[PDB]
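The passage that follows is intended for readers who have already worked through the single-chain material. We present the inputs for a multi-component assembly, then the predicted structure in tokenized form, and finally a short commentary. You are encouraged to pause after the input and sketch how you expect the pieces to fit together before reading on.
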Amino acid sequence: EVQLVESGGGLVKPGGSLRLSCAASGFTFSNYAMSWVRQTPEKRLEWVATISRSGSYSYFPDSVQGRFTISRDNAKNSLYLQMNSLRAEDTAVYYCARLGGYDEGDAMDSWGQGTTVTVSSASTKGPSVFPLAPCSRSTSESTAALGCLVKDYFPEPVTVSWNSGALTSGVHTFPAVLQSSGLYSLSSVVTVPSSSLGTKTYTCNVDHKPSNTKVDKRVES
Amino acid sequence: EKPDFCFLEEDPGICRGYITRYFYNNQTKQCERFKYGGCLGNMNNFETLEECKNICEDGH
Amino acid sequence: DIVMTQTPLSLSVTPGQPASISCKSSQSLLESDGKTYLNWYLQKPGQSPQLLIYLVSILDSGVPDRFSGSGSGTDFTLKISRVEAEDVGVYYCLQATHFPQTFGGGTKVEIKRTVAAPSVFIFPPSDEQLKSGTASVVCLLNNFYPREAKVQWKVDNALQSGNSQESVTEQDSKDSTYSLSSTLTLSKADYEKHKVYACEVTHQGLSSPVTKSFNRGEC
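Having made your guess, compare it with the prediction:
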């Protein structure tokens, strides 16, 4: 019931800086060393920092060593990875993990869901959110699909829920495609009972944190 | 009684020539594994588990 | 640094049949305490990697006993005795005997299921989008198996190519299916010149192609 919750990712210009935070809950934090692991777009994984229990000592591999620094706050159950001198190749999702101890073969565990870091010279751009609704509805049908087209944003990622997370069954949120413009576009869909279309509302909640854009798009059929 | 250095946090020193070493963890009450960078640090720093066990468990 | 080579890159396994994934290290992982610091992770669809097995063969809390780990020195083996729907995902190895600790490149696991035809739906572009001078037409293929699926866009029966993008979700952990969205992008000027917008779908589960279309302006 350990939970680690990373925050702090965004777009940063090459040679620029960014701090990431990890908020830990559900265990005696100061009993454990704590780690950061990153995952590249090619889905390679790479350990990139460890901080000792007291927060006095840290380890880093050669690829980041001298650019990154780490610190923790045991009264707050948090730790922070300060990244400097950022280069194109530090683009990755960064995950916080707990170094599980000698009885657990020093394995990292309980990785958070991760925060996404993008090192690029480009500007951010928030998405447009357009409805996906049938031109007209085939009567009479068991199930109807609705969705949202989240178009023309940068950088990755975008998060989508439905009905503030109350609707999860039948949702498919697709991976974004990168377009010739150098902007991303993604769709999210849900299938529902056609008989519900006159009774329930369906709203896609879109979050684009790098541009600080949230959008609630009600989709009507 | 055990030596005082058994109660110190394990310290990798300030070098990067990392080699496995063993230290006593008083929170867990056992000898455990860390990477030592090869220079400085402290005396809670053993070449084998067996040695850690014989020095930082009990009163010899 | 120690290089960890995993094979195969991917595997597709009949439900209830066993599966095996190899991890090979470029130097021995045997540590000076006599243990071996080799670990297996699972990254499930939409989740971060989770610890399955540490010290070569030790299961983490809550990991099903279908899974086991073996090997030593440089050669390691993850086994799933009888594969289930929940096991789909990318498996990684990690060694931590040597600094820095280093991962394998991953192995994707797919599970086999009965052939399932997609449910196909087409969406016209929104009037809201059309105002800014772009028309995105979207075709959805929902919950199918196997992965291979063909979408053919047709605009008044002119077959379109080079004109669309698509993506596919990761096999689903509960029902073992895939879903796919494909977008056809046109200028509003071009979109305005044509009537019948159609997505045609070919898939092993359909005795012949299924077409979904609308007529522009009848929206």
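Commentary: The CA atoms of residues 72 and 79 of chain A lie 4 Å apart. The interface with chain B takes residues 31, 52-54, 56-57, 59, 65, 101-103, 106 of chain A (CB under 8 Å). How closely did your sketch match?
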